[PDB]
Design a protein around this ligand. Structure first.
Ligand SMILES: [Cl-]
Lengths: 12, 57, 63
């Protein structure tokens, strides 16, 4: 999960 | 640490990696980054503002 | 189904939130503007989106 683009992109 | 949180209100994604959920949905929380949390619900993943949920103990 | 000019609103009885092309999403109690009716599926607008949804998931609001 820590390698998903969704996560890596961050909230902003 | 897989915390569970219940949506207090519905929230619609602002960006392509924001989580969508409805009031009363139970969200699995993977990370807490100050005011934004990363989690999963209904098989989808994304970020959301923590104000929208309450931890289920 | 609907006559030209007809004005109709309906309230969601339950949430229907899975994203699919041509599907309108909403949460329970959302008020939807109903634009067309075609048997068991209606076309509507809410929260900046349009799409089809099961008519059974909503109840018409009196004018
Ligand atoms: Cl759905």
């Amino acid at each position: 999960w820590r390698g998903s683009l969704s996560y890596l992109k961050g909230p902003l | 640490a897989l915390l569970k949180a219940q949506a207090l209100c519905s929230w619609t994604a602002k960006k392509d990696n924001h989580l969508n959920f409805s009031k009363h949905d139970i969200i699995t929380v993977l990370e807490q980054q100050e005011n934004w949390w990363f989690g999963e619900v209904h098989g989808g993943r994304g970020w959301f503002p923590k104000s929208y949920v309450k931890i289920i103990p």
